[PDB]
Amino acid sequence: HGSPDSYRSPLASRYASPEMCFVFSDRYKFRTWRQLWLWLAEAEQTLGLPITDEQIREMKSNLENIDFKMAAEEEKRLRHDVMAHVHTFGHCCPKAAGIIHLGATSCYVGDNTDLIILRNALDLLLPKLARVISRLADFAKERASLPTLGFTHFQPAQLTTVGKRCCLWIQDLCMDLQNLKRVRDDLRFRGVKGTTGTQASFLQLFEGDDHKVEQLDKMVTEKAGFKRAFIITGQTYTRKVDIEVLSVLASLGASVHKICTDIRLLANLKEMEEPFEKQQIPYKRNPMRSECCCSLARHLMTLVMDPLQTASVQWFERTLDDSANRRICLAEAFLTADTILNTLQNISEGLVVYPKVIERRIRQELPFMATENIIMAMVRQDCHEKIRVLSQQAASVVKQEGGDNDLIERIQVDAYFSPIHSQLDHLLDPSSFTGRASQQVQRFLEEEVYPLLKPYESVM
Amino acid sequence: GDHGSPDSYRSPLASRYASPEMCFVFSDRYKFRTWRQLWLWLAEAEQTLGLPITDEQIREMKSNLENIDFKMAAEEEKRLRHDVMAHVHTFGHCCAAGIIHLGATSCYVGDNTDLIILRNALDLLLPKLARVISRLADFAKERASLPTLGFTHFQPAQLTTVGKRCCLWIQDLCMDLQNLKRVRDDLRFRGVKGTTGTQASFLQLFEGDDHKVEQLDKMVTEKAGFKRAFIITGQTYTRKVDIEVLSVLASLGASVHKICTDIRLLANLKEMEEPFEKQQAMPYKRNPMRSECCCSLARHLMTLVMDPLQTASVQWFERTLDDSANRRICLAEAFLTADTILNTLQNISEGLVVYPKVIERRIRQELPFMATENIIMAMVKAGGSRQDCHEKIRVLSQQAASVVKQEGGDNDLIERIQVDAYFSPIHSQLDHLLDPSSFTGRASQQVQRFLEEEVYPLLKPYES
Amino acid sequence: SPDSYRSPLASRYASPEMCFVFSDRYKFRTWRQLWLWLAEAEQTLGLPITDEQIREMKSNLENIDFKMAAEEEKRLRHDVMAHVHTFGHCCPKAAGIIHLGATSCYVGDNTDLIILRNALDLLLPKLARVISRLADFAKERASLPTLGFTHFQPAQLTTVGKRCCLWIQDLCMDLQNLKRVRDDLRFRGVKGTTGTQASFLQLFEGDDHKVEQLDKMVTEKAGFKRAFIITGQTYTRKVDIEVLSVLASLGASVHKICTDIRLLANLKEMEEPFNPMRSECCCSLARHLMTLVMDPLQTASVQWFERTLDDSANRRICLAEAFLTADTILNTLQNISEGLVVYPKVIERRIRQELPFMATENIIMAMVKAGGSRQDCHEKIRVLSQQAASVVKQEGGDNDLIERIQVDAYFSPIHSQLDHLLDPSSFTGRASQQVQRFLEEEVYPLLKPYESV
Amino acid sequence: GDHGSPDSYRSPLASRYASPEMCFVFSDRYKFRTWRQLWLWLAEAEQTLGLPITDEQIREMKSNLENIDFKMAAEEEKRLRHDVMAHVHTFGHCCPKAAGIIHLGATSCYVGDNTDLIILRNALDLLLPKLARVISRLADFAKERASLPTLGFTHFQPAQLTTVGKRCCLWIQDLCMDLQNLKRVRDDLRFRGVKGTTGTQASFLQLFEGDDHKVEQLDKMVTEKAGFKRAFIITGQTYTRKVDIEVLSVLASLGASVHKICTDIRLLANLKEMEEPFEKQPYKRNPMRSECCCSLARHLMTLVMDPLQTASVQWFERTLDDSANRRICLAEAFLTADTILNTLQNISEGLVVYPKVIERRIRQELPFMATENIIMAMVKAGGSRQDCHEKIRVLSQQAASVVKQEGGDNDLIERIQVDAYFSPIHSQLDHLLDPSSFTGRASQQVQRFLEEEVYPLLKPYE
């Protein structure tokens, strides 16, 4: 990762998985440059430019044989990123030197590489998000019936289930999964367009034949594995593309942050905890992996303003005031999302529920929500008011003298509630207060979640 | 008055900027009508599932949907400090009263109203957006072959065409149209969910009947005009929907700002101007005032995206009420702003002024510096020499540059070539070698293909 | 009119005084006010302006015809020239001398600076009054022990007043910031179309000193200590960044406080004056305040040269909204701070249910002094903790670590004063003393200039 | 290598962009040095306060600040899960004599949180002279070009003439406000000191046997040694996260200014009026350095939402959900800012001005702005106002058509000069269109601004 004598990005050197790091590495970047020049030359041969099979063979064998030292020093001399690599690749491919980058300009390698990078980055996030959704869905099913105190205003609300509450987190990740897939499939190749998008150099190279330029653009698009290319660009693809991508990651950021806020709140209530590793026979447990996910999700929300501002200040066919900003924020958003999903998969595998803790809290709150079922079970005016005064004193005891709720007791002795004694244990059954929470979990998993997850069954 | 008094603050978004249609969809009249419209649909679905509601009770609601007493509603809200219940009383006062809102909570009306408002607001933006695109398309077709100086780094570069440049704007607006359409299509109804989304109150109402509660959830969803309803909600629909909606407006703001920034730059170059207003010739100096307003307003949209993002991130459990005030402001203001922008942008597109002679004058100044490759190629074809020509053209290029920079004169490079003996085997070809049209690449063909494949197919559903 | 949209901030949220500051009555009245000051200064410096013309203007500052002015703008397509003419119509004798030598931003930008300053002046007392009522609560509850929270997890005891000082300290930092931006706000003055004072220079036929003088006079009349030396058409949009930055910071502070109050309401240790609806309202609007900061940031980044008019419509929206939003928050925070209710028994319970686990060191250092070993006590205390933790977590019961230590024969010398070893006040450190010190050295001096009168 | 292998992502801020000094400030070698330097200060102060620390232990501690075993600490961190105790052990290992008195009575954030504040302040100290240095270069330029008339620009349309030096003062003023805000925030930065787990100083009070006086003066001593004038009286576990908001707010604002300057330079580059420095070894020159600054400034403006959101959701005495966000955003903000200023210093050094392209654009626009001047000269010679205004009006329409509908030069002056009606002012015409008389007070505004504001603001930094 490098020396401690200098600053190191905590995302690469500490947080993110090596795979995502490699996608944004200089090796991947410059390999892809060489790959693009190969596809270019191959297509140009087919279209009748003087390129031999020996020159193609030379380029194919030397895609990974990159001299970084020599390339960086040639940049210093030629003050050009692309020209330096054209020359370097030429030195290790002496037969091909005269045909590399023929007709093209800088953005053929620069911009198309970012597109290939963008796509590859989404492709690694997809199964990670799919794997989180699946494990939460496992958990959702097991705890689909378990009654838990609902919360609105973070206050005692009617009963829900742990499996129901989990399905709220799952659905947000599902909207995100659908969004990531939609953006990945819509990405288009820039292809060959020239300095200003007019294909003027390539038109001159193919001595004025429009049809040949059209074919060239089709051929590299397909070699690159892209279904579609832009008809219209300036020098580069429209920077709107980066907004579309980072908007969805920002949206994922906000969903994750919400999931982790919930878990941190439940971990205070002792109702649920993060998984442990290295475990066996501490009381105090910090939800550190959830606090980490929040911290990083935040940064993922912040980054969306960068591509927005960039897109707004692009003058005409392009200005280079996007270049540096894009080298930073694109990498960060993906490495940030990658980390979040790796850490979120850990949290989701074995979430620890504490049933008796959840049952205790419910018992403290249920007699204040069961009052209506007591009245509609007596066969109204003197039963709405005579139970109310008992609630007055029981609510006065809980707040003014912090402790247990004894409303059950106050009814269990009063003469007025004579017949309703025989049916109190059934009237205070927690599951009868949970509504369709169980039915809803089931139907959600079968109609929405399972159809979505199936294309990912190979890797779990 | 018909809006507000001068002695109080009035948002200029409502008073000075947006159209009456978009302003209506966010008004309290439309909001409280929609509340009554939801209560009506519920009662209809409730009766059709065998609940004790009379066909007379229904028609008293069906007739009194518009009849809203605004002073009584505000006083019962002064009494109970609860807006939904206050409107329940007021509707029952003019009606029936005992069957209003039965089994439902506040968010049956306060949350399904938002989704109807969002859907209708998107309905207002769509045809306005297609209209702009349509106008620019015609401008792009008309100007498809008019050579213009290309700009990278905002320095002169390979020529393009006005039509081609306009397609860059069109493309961005077409992606916005597609995103607005998708997000409107993907919008789902909350339906009947109860206080925490468990539907407990409606299960009680239908006496434990699971199938019946779901039958109600389907009935009110179709009545509201939605293809699909959420299975999973807390008290409200997920605040993620607000993010998808304002994300696409934010992106649209980005597009517009860029389009309008280009226009202001073109205006300075005097190559393009905004349409003429009337008088009773036109003035020499003209500020791109309408473009600057669009830029100003677009900026607001890009900013608003952070509101729904932060909101969604800190929603604890089934629901917290720290979304309420923030949503009252940012939802309406996003749409009101977008609406203003589209109205203004359409106005700009109707008769953009082009000045062909100014475009030509800038081209004649810059082109010779970009055309030396074509001069060398033409020499070699008639017995010339590459390195001899380069060095005997690099020197005249540096002389011409000096007059333009150090002296601030007109570019004389062509004139320096038109007399120089070394370039005698080329003099009959100089004007043809500097034909702007032969420098525009495939620009005009790109316009034609793009319009035929990607613009008219999208505009087809909006012909009227 | 319910048949049209109304800004919730404007209608049914913010104070009538703040709404008035951003009203058009106040705006156009200030325009007229600034024209009079310009006329007054110009007479002094020797232009043909008569006292009659000046009295005509001083009488008609509030006499504004919004119908006429609005109709004349449609015809002239100029907001300032529309109001020059309207003012000239109700002051026929003044007509020719209004706005003499001036440009549009003389009224446009100096009005926005007058508005900003006056809007800050309304924010300062309200904030001070909030800080003052939290300081009383802080003093009242300085000694009351409460459970400290790190990671939202039980942590070393603090006091209620000490926790309140965390909130106070954030608000005080905002108070100093609002005051520093207010006091160091500068006047645009008279600058001309591009900032070069060219027309004023020609109006006084070349007299440089007369232009400086005119600039000084209007600046003093408007109640500012300094004018900008350098401007384009307008004052730098960096000023709007600095103002909205401090309000955004205040937003973040407020949001933190109201989130803390919302969690305590869940813990039933504290309640709002009679669902923490007001704190949710506060959080929701604090959030919108934080959002706004990107507007002037984006604006100032893309101003080309002496002025571009892409700031105009965005400023009309973000400026007023930030102050109306700020205002609303402070009015609501004042109502929360007026009736905060702590429930001491609920707090006492939670402590007793969590203190035993944190008190493990004090029992050891009472045992080691009694003869026992640090090895032979840490081992025995851990097995009894393992037993207590099961009852709480696996059985959802009461923390009986206090009971279990009384039945174990090992801790026999320790029995005599377990009341003292688990006395919550001994676990609070310097909390109360930290409160008294902070209030007297930092808070009270800051509130000293206010509270008057 | 040391700047990372090409097989992994390497931040372009640390490797490619920022200066070495700023990179070292956020390096782990600086972080762990300071951690250890803070333990020394803690030990020295405690010994003075009567605790059992030997001067043998102080000297052993003082010698082993530089030599850090990173391999040991990382593996100890794996074994412990505590980053501080990992370095408490690794320090206690190489300093065996003083193993019992390292981190005595202290909490994790004594080193974590105070280090953050020390870095913040050293980073600000690197930025300030760099900012001053830039302002100073532009000042020189703005004095030199103080009387060079140039076309004013409102709406990006021709307007009343300013001077090149006056326009530069517009840029300088934004950077001077940035300088003022940076210094203030640097000086108003408070030390976290010794506060314990939740800010109550409980463990320190315990070790000083209930003595408040000794707690308070330990806080003051270590603050003094760290170089701070003032400590917080009130903290949770850490210093309030409102501090990070103040710091990144002023950087975002600097970013905003730098973006405006560089946008202006980019536009002037197109107009061929002004260019970025040569440093040669052509005709078309892209302003690549101004574009770099703009790109980097934009990111700086974006970062402000990090600390804002962070502060807004800090529950009670502290939550760890700020940790990861702060490591990225703070470091990145100072790396970017430093890079921007480095590039800005380079731009200021040898900015190229083209006086004859400036003169050309004036001659094209000025005649339209000089109409009232001409009518006044005509009336002064006993002429008719209404006839003169109508003549100018018609000649102005003809000349505008040539410019817009024919793409010609402005020929308004030549039309006036060949018209016999204008005979009374024909001799006055060169003088009437002297651009210098159209600049207002621009040349004096520069001198006043530089004397009264700039140089007094620069004096501490010379």
UniProtKB/Swiss-Prot annotation, chain A:
Impact after mutating residue 380 to H: In ADSLD; severe; abolishes cooperativity and reduces enzyme activity
Annotated tissue distribution: Ubiquitously expressed. Both isoforms are produced by all tissues. Isoform 2 is 10-fold less abundant than isoform 1.
Outcome (variant: residue 307 to L): In ADSLD; severe
Enzyme class at the top of the EC tree: lyase
Effect of residue 66 to V: In ADSLD; severe
SUPFAM superfamilies, per database record: L-aspartase-like
GO-annotated biological processes: 'de novo' AMP biosynthetic process; 'de novo' IMP biosynthetic process; 'de novo' XMP biosynthetic process; aerobic respiration; AMP biosynthetic process; AMP salvage; GMP biosynthetic process; purine nucleotide biosynthetic process
Consequence the record notes for mutating residue 188 to C: In ADSLD; severe; reduces protein stability
GO MF, one annotated term: identical protein binding
Binding site for substrate: 14-15, 79-81, 105-106, 235, 292, 318, 323, 327
Effect of residue 414 to N: In ADSLD; mild
Modified residues (N6-acetyllysine): 141, 284
Reported effect, residue 94 to A: In ADSLD; moderate
Keyword vocabulary terms for this entry: Acetylation, Disease variant, Epilepsy, Isopeptide bond, Lyase, Purine biosynthesis, Ubl conjugation
Disease: Adenylosuccinase deficiency: An autosomal recessive disorder characterized by the accumulation in the body fluids of succinylaminoimidazole-carboxamide riboside (SAICA-riboside) and succinyladenosine (S-Ado). Most children display marked psychomotor delay, often accompanied by epilepsy or autistic features, or both, although some patients may be less profoundly retarded. Occasionally, growth retardation and muscular wasting are also present.
NCBIfam families in the record: purB
Protein name, entry field: Adenylosuccinate lyase
Lineage of the organism: Eukaryota, Metazoa, Chordata, Craniata, Vertebrata
Originating gene: ADSL
UniProtKB/Swiss-Prot annotation, chain C:
One cellular component term from this protein's GO annotations in UniProt: cytosol
Regulation: The enzyme reaction kinetics indicate cooperativity between subunits.
Record key words, sorted: Acetylation, Disease variant, Epilepsy, Isopeptide bond, Lyase, Purine biosynthesis, Ubl conjugation
Outcome, altering residue 374 to H: In ADSLD; severe; abolishes cooperativity and reduces enzyme activity
InterPro entries in the record: AdenyloSucc_lyase_C (IPR019468), Fumarate_lyase_CS (IPR020557), Fumarate_lyase_fam (IPR000362), Fumarate_lyase_N (IPR022761), L-Aspartase-like (IPR008948), Pur_lyase (IPR004769)
Residue positions where N6-acetyllysine is found in the record: 139
Chain residue numbers at which the record places covalent cross-link Glycyl lysine isopeptide (Lys-Gly) (interchain with G-Cter in SUMO1): 393
Protein role: Catalyzes two non-sequential steps in de novo AMP synthesis: converts (S)-2-(5-amino-1-(5-phospho-D-ribosyl)imidazole-4-carboxamido)succinate (SAICAR) to fumarate plus 5-amino-1-(5-phospho-D-ribosyl)imidazole-4-carboxamide, and thereby also contributes to de novo IMP synthesis, and converts succinyladenosine monophosphate (SAMP) to AMP and fumarate.
Pathology noted in the entry: Adenylosuccinase deficiency: An autosomal recessive disorder characterized by the accumulation in the body fluids of succinylaminoimidazole-carboxamide riboside (SAICA-riboside) and succinyladenosine (S-Ado). Most children display marked psychomotor delay, often accompanied by epilepsy or autistic features, or both, although some patients may be less profoundly retarded. Occasionally, growth retardation and muscular wasting are also present.
Subunit and partners: Homotetramer. Residues from neighboring subunits contribute catalytic and substrate-binding residues to each active site.
Family the UniProt entry places it in: Belongs to the lyase 1 family. Adenylosuccinate lyase subfamily.
Protein name according to UniProt: Adenylosuccinate lyase
Lineage of producing organism: Eukaryota, Metazoa, Chordata, Craniata, Vertebrata
